[PDB]
Amino acid sequence: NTTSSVILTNYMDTQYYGEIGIGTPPQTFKVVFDTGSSNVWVPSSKCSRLYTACVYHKLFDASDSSSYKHNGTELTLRYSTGTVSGFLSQDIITVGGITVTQMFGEVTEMPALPFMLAEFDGVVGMGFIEQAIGRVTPIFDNIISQGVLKEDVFSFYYNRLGGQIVLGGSDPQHYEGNFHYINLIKTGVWQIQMKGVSVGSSTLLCEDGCLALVDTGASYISGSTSSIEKLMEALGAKKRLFDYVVKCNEGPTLPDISFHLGGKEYTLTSADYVFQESYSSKKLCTLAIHAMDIPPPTGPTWALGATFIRKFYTEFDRRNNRIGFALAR
Amino acid sequence: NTTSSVILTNYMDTQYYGEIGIGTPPQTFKVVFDTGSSNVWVPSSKCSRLYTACVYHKLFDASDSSSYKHNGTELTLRYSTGTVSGFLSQDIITVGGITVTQMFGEVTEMPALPFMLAEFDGVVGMGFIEQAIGRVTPIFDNIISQGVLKEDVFSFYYNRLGGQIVLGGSDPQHYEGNFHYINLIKTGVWQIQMKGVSVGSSTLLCEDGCLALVDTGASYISGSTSSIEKLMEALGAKKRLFDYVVKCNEGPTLPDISFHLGGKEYTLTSADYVFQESYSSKKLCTLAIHAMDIPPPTGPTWALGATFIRKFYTEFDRRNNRIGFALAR
Numbered sequence: 001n002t003t004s005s006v007i008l009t010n011y012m013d014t015q016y017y018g019e020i021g022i023g024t025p026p027q028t029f030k031v032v033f034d035t036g037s038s039n040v041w042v043p044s045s046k047c048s049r050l051y052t053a054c055v056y057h058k059l060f061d062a063s064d065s066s067s068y069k070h071n072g073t074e075l076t077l078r079y080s081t082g083t084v085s086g087f088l089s090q091d092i093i094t095v096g097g098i099t100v101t102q103m104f105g106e107v108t109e110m111p112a113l114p115f116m117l118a119e120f121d122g123v124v125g126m127g128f129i130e131q132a133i134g135r136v137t138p139i140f141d142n143i144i145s146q147g148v149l150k151e152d153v154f155s156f157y158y159n160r161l162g163g164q165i166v167l168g169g170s171d172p173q174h175y176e177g178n179f180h181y182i183n184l185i186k187t188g189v190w191q192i193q194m195k196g197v198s199v200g201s202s203t204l205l206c207e208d209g210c211l212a213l214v215d216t217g218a219s220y221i222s223g224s225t226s227s228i229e230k231l232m233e234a235l236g237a238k239k240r241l242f243d244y245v246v247k248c249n250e251g252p253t254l255p256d257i258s259f260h261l262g263g264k265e266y267t268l269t270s271a272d273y274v275f276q277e278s279y280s281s282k283k284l285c286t287l288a289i290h291a292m293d294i295p296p297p298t299g300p301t302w303a304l305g306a307t308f309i310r311k312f313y314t315e316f317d318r319r320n321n322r323i324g325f326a327l328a329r
Numbered sequence: 330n331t332t333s334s335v336i337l338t339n340y341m342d343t344q345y346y347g348e349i350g351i352g353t354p355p356q357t358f359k360v361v362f363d364t365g366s367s368n369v370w371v372p373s374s375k376c377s378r379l380y381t382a383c384v385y386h387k388l389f390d391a392s393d394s395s396s397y398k399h400n401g402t403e404l405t406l407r408y409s410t411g412t413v414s415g416f417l418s419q420d421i422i423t424v425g426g427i428t429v430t431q432m433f434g435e436v437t438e439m440p441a442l443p444f445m446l447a448e449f450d451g452v453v454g455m456g457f458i459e460q461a462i463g464r465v466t467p468i469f470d471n472i473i474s475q476g477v478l479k480e481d482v483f484s485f486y487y488n489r490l491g492g493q494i495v496l497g498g499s500d501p502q503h504y505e506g507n508f509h510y511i512n513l514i515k516t517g518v519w520q521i522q523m524k525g526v527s528v529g530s531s532t533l534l535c536e537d538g539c540l541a542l543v544d545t546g547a548s549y550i551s552g553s554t555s556s557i558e559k560l561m562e563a564l565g566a567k568k569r570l571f572d573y574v575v576k577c578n579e580g581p582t583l584p585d586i587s588f589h590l591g592g593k594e595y596t597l598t599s600a601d602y603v604f605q606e607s608y609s610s611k612k613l614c615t616l617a618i619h620a621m622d623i624p625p626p627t628g629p630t631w632a633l634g635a636t637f638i639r640k641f642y643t644e645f646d647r648r649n650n651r652i653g654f655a656l657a658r
């Protein structure tokens with residue numbers, strides 16, 4: 001049946017984006033594919049320059065598409081970081097060589113913080129309809145509906161060809177060994193149960209289990225405030241407003257951290273979670289983990305983002321309601 | 330004797346910048362005048378595009394100035410938000426019509442977060458030599474040395490002509506009534522003692538006194554984490570990663586807050602500290618106060634930034650080692 005690959009661009013290990021086409025003739029946008037949300041949005045032409053982010057990103061022109069079909073229902077999307085607003089609209093979107101008719105948001109309010117840090121123009125949510133603001137049907141469900149993929153699976157490869165997403169399968173040239181599957185805990189959200197976070201060889205957190213959201217659109221690993229505090233305490237890291245830091249010379253003295261998912265320990269070492277700019281002292285190096293209080297019902301949960309995904313080739317399987325991981329290569 | 334005015338630009342109540350000229354012929358830069366630090370820096374030509382902030386800001390070309398005199402000593406400047414590095418250099422800088430020969434840093438490392446949010450290109454520190462990285466003499470001391478101002482005072486006017494700094498005096502067309510002075514607590518830093526932070530009519534914080542740094546280069550009012558927690562609890566605000574928020578419809582139900590400085594209560598009302606984008610519910614409005622742990626020896630202290638200054642015309646008096654405040658207009 002069908003399998004499409006979507007080539008991603010790695011921007012500093014913190015932004016992995018690819019391209020989609022909207023409208024007829026197609027208008028191209030760079031978007032992050034986020035498993036933590038389910039709406040599609042891009043910036044709109046109706047966005048005021050009285051919003052800088054809109055001056056520095058690609059804007060979608062409805063009047064230039066033949067397939068545009070107006071909706072206009074208002075839309076507000078509150079993310080962990082960043083809130084965007086605009087109105088709903090409909091047109092054809094093609095990603096990976098597959099064209100679907102999709103309801104997407106045209107954004108007219110895009111805050112500078114965090115959008116001016118953005119190298120992408122928008123977001124394509126790869127979550128479930130239960131997370132979809134406006135009960136709008138997610139792009140992948142529509143894709144599935146079209147009945148064309150070999151399987152109802154999608155895979156993420158984040159590199160250290162900055163990346164690659166495979167719709168309807170996996171690419172083995174990017175993972176070593178077999179996959180290890182963990183079942184969805186609840187349906188409607190990509191979350192699984194975690195059985196412990198260990199430092200070195202000791203279980204410090206989440207000992208009586210906890211939840212992990214597997215989120216491709218989160219650049220770092222997240223944990224609740226209370227947990228990250230305890231963790232950083234253990235690693236010997238300092239809190240900055242924007243990140244946890246460590247003297248760069250100490251980067252390689254930092255213990256390994258491991259996530260107990262399902263039947264395995266998934267370990268990240270100092271090399272996987274420190275942005276080792278220098279081995280120089282008196283120069284603070286960033287850790288790729290930070291705190292994030294995700295409100296219920298979905299939170300509190302950890303969030304295994306790009307720091308994790310970079311090491312573990314991730315498979316999102318919609319037929320079986322489960323997630324598989326294999327070592328990336 | 331002499332008085333110069335420096336016209337500032339208000340960018341969203343969060344960035345107040347003006348212009349200086351460097352080199353011969355002069356190279357123009359927009360800089361924030363920060364009373365919280367003492368070095369001068371601008372971006373350098375030797376900055377890599379492999380740093381986006383440098384692609385979007387004005388860069389200083391040493392080779393194009395006749396007056397440039399090479400130094401090259403390395404320099405790292407760690408701010409509350411943002412760390413910049415580069416090397417030291419010397420050339421003439423003119424601000425406000427006064428030319429001095431100054432040692433400034435040429436920045437070659439400028440992180441995206443927070444610099445891509447920057448509408449200015451650099452910083453001009455208006456602090457004391459005790460805060461000067463590299464023991465480099467501050468621009469104002471050099472100005473003073475030139476022996477030309479009417480007085481050793483500088484005044485800040487932040488508007489809601491987005492602003493105006495007066496070197497060597499004050500501009501009365503921007504303040505109502507007389508000034509109220511508070512003595513420096515310690516010399517070498519613009520910090521005074523505070524006698525209480527009240528909510529409504531009750532003293533909630535800093536009851537046995539505390540320290541306040543008067544910082545023009547801080548967009549919001551700052552307090553230590555423990556204090557802001559208690560304060561926000563009292564105002565009924567929610568914590569976002571980047572700011573404290575409140576439902577916009579509640580903006581005007583928020584109590585007044587008052588700072589007991591010296592012999593007066595300085596009160597900010599909901600109107601002064603909420604970024605009232607809408608009176609619409611289900612739409613989070615930003616408070617202009619946040620938490621900031623300033624390490625000792627200077628910290629812990631509060632930081633009365635632009636939110637404060639906008640309401641209270643501030644005078645920094647170097648002859649007498651004190652700070653005066655008057656109502657802005």
Ligand SMILES: CCCCNC(=O)[C@@H](C[C@H](O)[C@H](CC1CCCCC1)NC(=O)[C@H](Cc1cnc[nH]1)NC(=O)[C@H](Cc1ccccc1)CS(=O)(=O)C(C)(C)C)C(C)C
Pocket residue numbers: 014015032034035036037038077078079080081082114115117118119123131133213215216217218219220221222242292294298303305442
């Ligand atoms: C509208 C319903 C959305 C529901 N879901 C969410 O908000 C999920 C978060 C979500 O996956 C979003 C998806 C991204 C897509 C890119 C644009 C912003 C949002 N991620 C974030 O909010 C995460 C935070 C997080 C980590 N762990 C949990 N949450 N944000 C980030 O990683 C930020 C992503 C980003 C990167 C560059 C430019 C703009 C934005 C990076 S960042 O945290 O601001 C920083 C720069 C590392 C400090 C939560 C619930 C799990």
Ligand SMILES: CCCCNC(=O)[C@@H](C[C@H](O)[C@H](CC1CCCCC1)NC(=O)[C@H](Cc1cnc[nH]1)NC(=O)[C@H](Cc1ccccc1)CS(=O)(=O)C(C)(C)C)C(C)C
Pocket residue numbers: 113343344361363364365366367406407408409410411443444446447448452460462542544545546547548549550551571621623627632634
């Ligand atoms: C090298 C020695 C410096 C020593 N001094 C300081 O760092 C002082 C902070 C200092 O006044 C600096 C001066 C500014 C000048 C503009 C560029 C960055 C720094 N201010 C900050 O770090 C303050 C934080 C603070 C508040 N209260 C205490 N500290 N930062 C800000 O206000 C940020 C200023 C900014 C604005 C736009 C673009 C870039 C940067 C705003 S922000 O906090 O990031 C935010 C966007 C409101 C979240 C501390 C010690 C009082």
Ligand SMILES: *[C@@H]1O[C@H](CO)[C@@H](O)[C@H](O)[C@H]1NC(C)=O
Pocket residue numbers: 070071072073
């Ligand atoms: C927009 O589509 C939504 C689907 O939820 C529908 O309720 C609404 O009526 C549509 N608006 C228009 C103008 O068709």
Ligand SMILES: *[C@@H]1O[C@H](CO)[C@@H](O)[C@H](O)[C@H]1NC(C)=O
Pocket residue numbers: 399400401402
């Ligand atoms: C730079 O000026 C500093 C002043 O602290 C001095 O110690 C250093 O020697 C100067 N560098 C050169 C090359 O003159």
